[PDB]
Design a protein around this ligand. Structure first.
Ligand SMILES: *[B](O[C][C])(O[C][C])[C]([C][C][C][C][N])[N]C(=O)[C]([N]C(=O)[C]([C])[N]C(=O)OC([C])([C])[C])[C]([C])[C]
Length: 223
């Protein structure tokens, strides 16, 4: 997260780290057995780590559960990143308490101007690299689809939204992929991609979760 703040231990309780020997992606817990993340985060042998703050120290609130299945969206296109969303089923249900909890799925799409919380363990520098060990948080508005489209000409599909600061300075970055964009208490986006991090006139682009609500409910009901 570039230009954000230390969240505080377990203040973002649906935040998961996806681990295959090291943290490689974030995700959100949507019920005790399923996580949503970005399809570009796919790999075999994911261990899901819940109740995390410092990802390098066991502090006592952690639940590490292996993934049983991963389902990348049927129309995920890696060359355009259209439909960049995946579901991960846990091998056992997580225990939900105040520090480990699920995030609500939206029933409406969020409007531009809505403020959102984006969180994660990715790079905190626009140029150069420092990866935090503790979870960082960023509050950012959803930008209008005209500003988004003028910033990324011929690249925003109807399943993408931009959130951030056109002036730059604050943004999601490498290592935040798959993590939550939560607006008004509902999960509205997934950290997807952008031209670098925190560059002027290049805000982050996010998978628009409200467009996937029926595919998510359907898939959970049948697996
Ligand atoms: B993400 O985070 C860690 C798992 O995923 C893999 C490195 C990161 C999140 C970036 C958020 C930025 N606001 N996602 C990516 O790096 C994705 N790639 C891009 O965004 C690239 C760097 N963008 C790019 O080349 O820009 C254009 C010229 C506009 C195409 C990708 C791996 C999904």
């Amino acid at each position: 997260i570039v230009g954000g703040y230390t969240c505080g231990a377990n203040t973002v309780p649906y935040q998961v780290s996806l681990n295959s020997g090291y943290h490689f992606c974030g995700g959100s817990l949507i019920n005790s057995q399923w996580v949503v993340s970005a399809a570009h985060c796919y790999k075999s042998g994911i261990q899901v780590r819940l109740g995390e703050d410092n990802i390098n120290v066991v502090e006592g609130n952690e639940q590490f559960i292996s993934a049983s299945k991963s389902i990348v969206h049927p129309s995920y296109n890696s060359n355009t990143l259209n439909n960049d969303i995946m579901l991960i089923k846990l091998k056992s249900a997580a225990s939900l308490n105040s520090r480990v909890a699920s995030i609500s799925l939206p029933t409406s799409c969020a409007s531009a101007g809505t403020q959102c919380l984006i969180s994660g363990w990715g790079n905190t520098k626009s140029s150069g690299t420092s990866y935090p060990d503790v979870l960082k948080c960023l509050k950012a508005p959803i930008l209008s689809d005209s500003s988004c489209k003028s910033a990324y000409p011929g690249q925003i599909t109807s399943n993408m939204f931009c959130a951030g600061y056109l002036e730059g300075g604050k943004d999601s970055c490498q290592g935040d992929s798959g993590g939550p964009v939560v607006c008004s208490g509902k999960l509205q986006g997934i950290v997807s991609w952008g031209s670098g991090c925190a560059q002027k006139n290049k805000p982050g682009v996010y998978t628009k979760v409200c467009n996937y609500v029926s595919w998510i409910k359907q898939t959970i009901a049948s697996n």
